[PDB]
Amino acid sequence: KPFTVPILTVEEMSNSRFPIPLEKLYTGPSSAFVVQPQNGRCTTDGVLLGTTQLSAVNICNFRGDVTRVGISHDYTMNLVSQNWNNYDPTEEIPAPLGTPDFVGKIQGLLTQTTRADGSTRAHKATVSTGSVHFTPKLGSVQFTTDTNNDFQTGQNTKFTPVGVIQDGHQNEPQQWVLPNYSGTSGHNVHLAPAVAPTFPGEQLLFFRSTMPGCSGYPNMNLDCLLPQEWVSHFYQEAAPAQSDVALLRFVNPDTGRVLFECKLHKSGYITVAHTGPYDLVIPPNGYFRFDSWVNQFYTLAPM
């Protein structure tokens, strides 16, 4: 089966690390830090990695029953799956699929239905993924909410993420620092690998969005390695990789002209030939096109 990538434009696609649209493309150095996101990780032949699942609308969502912490405004959620069934902590994944893969305070609404009478409720809520109580691999997380009494026990409860907050400027979130999925009780396991360019003159290419800010002065940049639509495409197509590197051309169909070329690595990330931080300039109808299988030492034309 011939390999392909979607023909969708950047702004027609979704971030694979938070449920927001893609905005732009960015390249920059990343030698000084670890790039190891767990969402938006998929091989070109369709093997999902890390905590990656198939739809953007499930990312950084949580479901389960909740219990109040003491008489405070905090609630513990005993996590269940997307469809309210069991999460198995023994499955060899880092945490439930869709779990946040950055240290930060994510704000949203915690909603609940009482099954007996169909009554419903919603409260502003934040999950601090750097907290010792952020233990999704153990099956629970803790939320700070705007209520100390309105949530009932034994009722289906959902967190819908909206954005991020900060306290103290732009010092958090830390998008490239993974939370400890088991808190202080254990180290992270079964992670999608860290990624880095290996060929001189190359940098990663990032698919960038801006997370909404909900309080304070947060760092709102969020970069993913693959659009969510690419994850779903590769998962479905499962086209065999004929080498370790797929050569893509980013084309302006208005003119047929190639704007730049890049390497899509089989293990699921892109590099470009560039040195330095750069906000790419792309036309609104531009898109990526797979042209040929090449190798790790093929020299890209400068971006």
Ligand X SMILES: CC(=O)N[C@H]1[C@@H](O[C@H]2[C@@H](O)[C@@H](CO)O[C@H](O)[C@@H]2O[C@@H]2O[C@@H](C)[C@@H](O)[C@@H](O)[C@@H]2O)O[C@H](CO)[C@H](O)[C@@H]1O
Q: Does 283 bind a copy of itself (CB under 8 A)?
A: no
Report the distance separating Cα 110 and Cα 261, nearest Å.
Answer: 43
φ, ψ (nearest 5 deg) of residue 56: -65, -25
Cβ atoms within 10 Å of 36's Cβ, excluding its own:
18
Closest by CA position to 37, among listed 177, 187, 205: 177
CB 239 within 8 Å of CB 2: yes
Going by the DSSP 8-state scheme, the letter that residue 228 receives in this structure is: H
Judged by CB under 8 A, the chain residues 205 through 234 that form the site for a copy of itself are 212-218, 220, 229, 232
User: Based on CB atoms, which residue is closest to a copy of itself, 11 or 291?
Assistant: 11
Q: Does 147 bind a copy of itself (CB under 8 A)?
A: no
Q: Does 83 bind a copy of itself (CB under 8 A)?
A: yes
CA angle 6, 160, 39 (to 5 degrees): 40
Judged by CB under 8 A, the chain residues 157 through 176 that form the site for a copy of itself are 158, 160, 162-163, 165-166, 169-170
CB of 129 to ligand X, least distance (A): 18
Token representation of residue 208? 């960038």
Q: Does 67 bind a copy of itself (CB under 8 A)?
A: no
CB of 114 to ligand X, least distance (A): 6
Strand 221-224 to 202-210 pairing: antiparallel
Where do contacts with a copy of itself occur on this chain (CB under 8 A)? 6-8, 11-15, 19-21, 23, 53-58, 82-83, 107-109, 111-113, 117-122, 124, 158, 160, 162-163, 165-166, 169-170, 212-218, 220, 229, 232, 235-236
Where do contacts with ligand X occur on this chain (CB under 6 A)? 119-121, 147, 150, 167, 215-216
